[PDB]
Design a protein around this ligand. Structure first.
Ligand SMILES: CCCCCCCC/C=C\CCCCCCCC(=O)O[C@@H](COC(=O)CCCCCCCCCCCCCCC)COP(=O)([O-])OCC[N+](C)(C)C
Ligand SMILES: CCCCCCCC/C=C\CCCCCCCC(=O)O[C@@H](COC(=O)CCCCCCCCCCCCCCC)COP(=O)([O-])OCC[N+](C)(C)C
Ligand SMILES: CCCCCCCC/C=C\CCCCCCCC(=O)O[C@@H](COC(=O)CCCCCCCCCCCCCCC)COP(=O)([O-])OCC[N+](C)(C)C
Ligand SMILES: CCCCCCCC/C=C\CCCCCCCC(=O)O[C@@H](COC(=O)CCCCCCCCCCCCCCC)COP(=O)([O-])OCC[N+](C)(C)C
Ligand SMILES: CCCCCCCC/C=C\CCCCCCCC(=O)O[C@@H](COC(=O)CCCCCCCCCCCCCCC)COP(=O)([O-])OCC[N+](C)(C)C
Ligand SMILES: CCCCCCCC/C=C\CCCCCCCC(=O)O[C@@H](COC(=O)CCCCCCCCCCCCCCC)COP(=O)([O-])OCC[N+](C)(C)C
Ligand SMILES: CCCCCCCC/C=C\CCCCCCCC(=O)O[C@@H](COC(=O)CCCCCCCCCCCCCCC)COP(=O)([O-])OCC[N+](C)(C)C
Ligand SMILES: CCCCCCCC/C=C\CCCCCCCC(=O)O[C@@H](COC(=O)CCCCCCCCCCCCCCC)COP(=O)([O-])OCC[N+](C)(C)C
Ligand SMILES: CCCCCCCC/C=C\CCCCCCCC(=O)O[C@@H](COC(=O)CCCCCCCCCCCCCCC)COP(=O)([O-])OCC[N+](C)(C)C
Ligand SMILES: CCCCCCCC/C=C\CCCCCCCC(=O)O[C@@H](COC(=O)CCCCCCCCCCCCCCC)COP(=O)([O-])OCC[N+](C)(C)C
Ligand SMILES: Nc1ncnc2c1ncn2[C@@H]1O[C@H](COP(=O)(O)OP(=O)(O)OP(=O)(O)O)[C@@H](O)[C@H]1O
Ligand SMILES: Nc1ncnc2c1ncn2[C@@H]1O[C@H](COP(=O)(O)OP(=O)(O)OP(=O)(O)O)[C@@H](O)[C@H]1O
Ligand SMILES: Cn1c(=O)c2c(ncn2C)n(C)c1=O
Ligand SMILES: [Ca+2]
Ligand SMILES: [Ca+2]
Ligand SMILES: [Zn+2]
Ligand SMILES: [Zn+2]
Lengths: 546, 241
């Protein structure tokens, strides 16, 4: 009992759909370092997000494929974590320590920048205007103590410094993950689909049209676990393209690859930085700069940097940094996610509002225009519907923002030939423009709240009543006491499958057992059959009570 | 403390009308839906403060000449001459106004910034008033709906699943009144509690084998005697129990 209790965290068990269509239980070793890297909070958040997006998108046939992609991405993620864990050579070692510190404390720098923005705007909250020096107007910071102006300048400089550190930390932390995903997806399209060979990417996929650059670059498979993907694609498409067009397209030399594969020698680089200076791959660096430039988060950080520089230009440009709380706190993320949900609906219904307001505008211009006086000075009439521009502007602004119909502001239609027509006009304007359309906007956002809550509840229910791996309903396991909990914690566990991946990658191919080699060969051939679907060990040997 | 301060001044007794919220259960449910999504409510009024501050800095830098807020021409009452008064004026008047802040601001007609002021007022009315206040209202309405969903779910779970074993209702309802009989006689919460009382009351020497077995797991805190996914009916279904 004591041995099992001690080795229980390191013992991992899974169930695979093995040979002869039989569910087989596989037992293996889980490294303590791998387990700790998995229990790190960032990996937990990534797993939660992956489960949420899988359940929300509803992928069923591709669920195992998305699980494989998540496992590969997160293994590369803790590879990054292990790298960032804890003269010219001294310059390089201090540089890598500095980037290490930034990558470790990226989130703390983000919170520090947000707090600095709060402090800067709190200082700006005492800005005062006086025409006289402290026609043309002076903007001066009024404060009795007088300490907040040097504080403002120092805080501006420190905020820009911390924001630059945020860009550097993002580049050292999240950029490699994005590059790894792009290289992996490009390799999948190149090999398992032939996206550029015996097929052509369409003009719609600008991502493919830009990924065309790294086809011929010698550093194509960098930042990616597979470095022989080019050779594999060459091997499977040489019979179709004569191997010479493949060599030209993917940028190898057949003789060079043969003479390096049979036997290779190792050169020595000089310690000077010049060899790196002309050994940088220009095309691959251009492609990487392009993809990380179109990456959304890096765009947000670049916008933050431009905003900070314009904050140095004028201090009030720092007020735009209070929108950072929306991306920072997750509660604003959910609330503004419900706001942005049905966003096409929102913008196109305010367009419908514009259209119906234009119809009311043309009606009011053709007749009822005498009521649009909008003037108290009798000698100087201020006709607001004397032309379509001013009438449409007046309607779309005043009548829309008014608490009721446009007749609230329009001169009262009493004792007129068009009295009933004006009454009908005002009632229809109030009932459609205000009562219906604004309530449509409000109902859209409220229903977006309800729909997002429904998504969260559905994800929780699916995770509670169905196993992620096999998909067997919970009641069959709950027939046995705590059966579903035991099944989802020991037999089929996402962490256990990931740790099997880590164990297979770590150990040598000569030490693989038959089951491990079988799983490894389907993992190399991208055939997700070993994942049990609709079958577990319990129903495999239910007659024998397992 | 409120009663003692009521002796100090009689008007401190007015705080005791909040006792009805804790007293009657209907106010408990209504104010429970109010307090539900309370972090949401307070942090969205914080978001309202942030966006109002953005509109405040925009209005301070330009459009500030329209914030006269004075009828006496000799004594201007500029409400956006500084960030304090501009932010206060926005966050109070413009938020509480029935529409945009342009309802109270001087009308932007015949000005170089006419279109800019129009866009400013439209955006203020559409985001500050139309969106955010409706977010608050939708939060409380969805809290009502979510609490009603909780009550309906509790009732449904109690109606279709036995509390003890968890077997679905349809298996018992195969027999007429089967679920009612099962939840009233075979597995009953009151019956299990009364077994607890009986075991505690009677002496340990008078315990039968089954009672000693249940008693020893109750002392060792092993809840295995509670049937889970199994009842007498499916235990002897072949023999018709
Ligand atoms: C103390 C409470 C701290 C809580 C503040 C919470 C609320 C924040 C905004 C309200 C103003 C703070 C305040 O009372 O400041 C006070 C000074 O005190 C300081 O200047 C404090 C900061 C430096 C120490 C004075 O108020 P003010 O409005 O800054 O006065 C100048 C206005 N003017 C520049 C527009 C002419
Ligand atoms: C610095 C060194 C020199 C490098 C320079 C490269 C500069 C980066 C842009 C080009 C590379 C990025 C790319 O794939 O094309 C972008 C072209 O986007 C535009 O042209 C935007 C205008 C794609 O823009 P997007 O909006 O991401 O396209 C939609 C999403 N999609 C990619 C899935 C289709
Ligand atoms: C936000 O809107 O950024 C958009 C990109 O960013 C852009 O589209 C360019 C910058 C927009 C600044 C105005 C907002 C989209 O943002 P995102 O894809 O959610 O990026 C996460 C932002 N974060 C890293 C700060 C959490
Ligand atoms: C940390 C230590 C370093 C802190 C920052 C130092 C430079 C500050 C800066 O932005 O430069 C300056 C230029 O500013 C701009 O004009 C910014 C333009 C950025 C690109 C905008 C694209 C749109 C702003 O700072 P400044 O010179 O003190 O302000 C006077 C601006 N002037 C000289 C342009 C009139
Ligand atoms: C990427 C996207 C980038 C977008 C950016 C694009 C800007 C492009 C470059 C602009 C260059 C000029 C800046 C400008 O407007 O100057 C004016 C200042 O500015 C203001 O008075 C407005 C400040 C805006 C406050 C925040 C609004 C947004 C809030 C959030 C909204 C959500 C006038 O200049 P000055 O006050 O005389 O300058 C003083 C210094 N000097 C005397 C030394 C010269
Ligand atoms: C007059 C004043 C108007 C201002 C008030 C209305 C605008 C505010 C909402 C803007 C918005 O949500 O933008 C949206 C962009 O827009 C589009 O998708 C359409 C282009 C945001 O995108 P989205 O709609 O979140 O895109 C995903 C759609 N989904 C979430 C529904 C799956
Ligand atoms: C997804 C679907 C989204 C749909 C969105 C729908 C949006 C609908 C939103 C409607 C808001 C109200 C607009 C009413 C029409 C007036 C336009 C205007 O600006 O004209 C003005 C002129 O100035 C110009 O012509 C300037 C250039 C045009 C700016 C247009 C901005 C709005 C679009 C007014 O001209 P005037 O009063 O005859 O002359 C006085 C002004 N002047 C002396 C400066 C010349
Ligand atoms: C039943 C029979 C007894 C009834 C109550 C008798 C004492 C009443 C009481 O509160 O005392 C007194 C003090 O009141 C306080 O000052 C209360 C302070 C309580 C703690 C507040 C913490 C904040 C109030 O009653 P009083 O003396 O008639 O009012 C005059 C108050 N004065 C003497 C302080 C000016
Ligand atoms: C400007 C004017 C603003 C006044 C109007 C808004 C405030 C009124 C609601 C206050 C409220 O609900 O407080 C909440 C406290 O608050 C927090 O939980 C956040 C701290 C009450 O707590 P709660 O949110 O019920 O806590 C449980 C959360 N649950 C019920 C969602 C599980
Ligand atoms: C979960 C997230 C929740 C977020 C909640 C967000 C809450 C947002 C709520 C916003 C309401 C509007 C506030 C606008 C700013 C003005 C502040 C103020 O009081 O200044 C005043 C000064 O008086 C002080 O400085 C007194 C101390 C500060 C009190 C601050 C209370 C509001 C916080 C005004 O100063 P002035 O007009 O320049 O001088 C005249 C007054 N004086 C002569 C008395 C000096
Ligand atoms: N094959 C499976 N592997 C793992 N979890 C599964 C599987 N099938 C279903 N589940 C469910 O996934 C849920 C995961 O939620 P849980 O909070 O336990 O995860 P966690 O990663 O330990 O959490 P956290 O990140 O909050 O520490 C479990 O409650 C379990 O019922
Ligand atoms: N094992 C169980 N023991 C008791 N009740 C169960 C069990 N399984 C399910 N139930 C359900 O619990 C419900 C309890 O509701 P009910 O109103 O009958 O209870 P009560 O305590 O008698 O009510 P009240 O407090 O209103 O007098 C029953 O309708 C029954 O269907
Ligand atoms: C499939 N696969 C991976 O997914 C992988 C890997 N090395 C790292 N990763 C992530 N190897 C060698 C591998 O064959
Ligand atoms: Ca072997
Ligand atoms: Ca006995
Ligand atoms: Zn399973
Ligand atoms: Zn039961």
């Amino acid at each position: 009992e004591s041995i099992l209790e001690y080795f229980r965290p390191y013992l991992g068990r899974i169930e695979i759909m093995g040979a002869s269509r039989r569910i087989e239980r596989i037992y293996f070793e889980i490294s303590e370092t791998n387990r700790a890297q998995w229990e790190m909070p960032q990996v937990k958040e990534s797993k939660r997000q992956f489960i949420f997006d899988v359940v929300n998108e509803g992928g069923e046939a591709e669920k195992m494929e998305l699980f494989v992609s998540f496992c590969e991405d997160t293994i590369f993620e803790m590879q990054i974590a292990a790298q960032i864990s804890e003269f010219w050579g001294e310059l390089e070692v201090q540089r890598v320590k500095f980037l290490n510190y930034l990558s470790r404390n990226f989130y703390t720098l983000r919170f520090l920048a947000l707090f600095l923005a709060f402090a800067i705007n709190f200082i700006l909250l005492f800005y005062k205007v006086s025409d006289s020096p402290p026609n043309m107007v002076y903007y001066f910071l009024e404060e009795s103590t007088g300490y907040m102006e040097p504080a403002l300048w120092c805080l501006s400089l420190l905020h820009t410094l911390v924001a630059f550190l945020c860009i550097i930390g993002y580049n050292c932390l999240k950029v490699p993950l994005v590059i790894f995903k792009r290289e992996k997806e490009l390799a999948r399209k190149l090999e398992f689909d032939g996206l550029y060979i015996t097929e052509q990417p369409g003009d719609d996929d600008v991502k493919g049209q830009w990924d065309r650059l790294v086809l011929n670059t010698p550093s194509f498979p960098s930042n990616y676990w597979d470095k022989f993907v080019k050779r594999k694609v060459l091997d499977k498409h040489g019979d179709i393209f004569g191997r010479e067009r493949i060599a030209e397209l993917l940028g190898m030399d057949l003789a060079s690859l043969e003479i390096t594969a049979h036997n290779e020698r190792k050169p020595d680089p000089p310690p000077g930085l010049l060899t790196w200076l002309m050994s940088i791959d220009v095309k691959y660096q251009i492609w990487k700069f392009g993809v990380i430039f179109t990456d959304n988060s890096f765009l947000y950080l670049g916008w933050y940097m431009v905003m900070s520089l314009l904050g140095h230009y004028n201090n009030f440009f720092f007020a735009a940094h209070l929108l950072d709380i929306a991306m920072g706190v997750k509660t604003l993320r959910t609330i503004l996610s419900s706001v942005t949900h049905n966003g096409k609906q929102l913008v196109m219904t305010v367009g419908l509002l514009a259209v119906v307001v234009y119809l009311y505008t043309v009606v009011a211009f053709n007749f009822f225009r005498k009521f649009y006086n909008k003037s108290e000075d009798e000698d100087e009439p201020d006709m607001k519907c004397d032309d379509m521009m001013t009438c449409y502007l007046f309607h779309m602004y005043v009548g829309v923002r008014a608490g009721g119909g446009i007749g609230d502001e329009i001169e009262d239609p009493a004792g007129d030939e068009y009295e009933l027509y004006r009454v009908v006009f005002d009632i229809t304007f109030f009932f459609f423009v205000i009562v219906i359309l604004l309530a449509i906007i409000q109902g859209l956002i409220i229903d977006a709240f309800g729909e997002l809550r429904d998504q969260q509840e559905q994800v929780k229910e699916d995770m509670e009543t169905k196993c992620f791996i096999c998909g067997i309903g919970s009641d069959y396991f709950d027939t046995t006491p705590h059966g579903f909990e035991t099944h989802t914690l020991e037999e089929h566990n996402l962490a256990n499958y990931m740790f099997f991946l880590m164990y297979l990658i770590n150990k040598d191919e000569t030490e693989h057992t038959g089951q491990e080699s079988y799983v490894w060969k389907m993992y190399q051939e991208r055939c997700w059959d070993f994942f049990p679907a609709g079958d577990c060990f319990r129903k495999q040997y239910e007659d024998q009570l397992s």
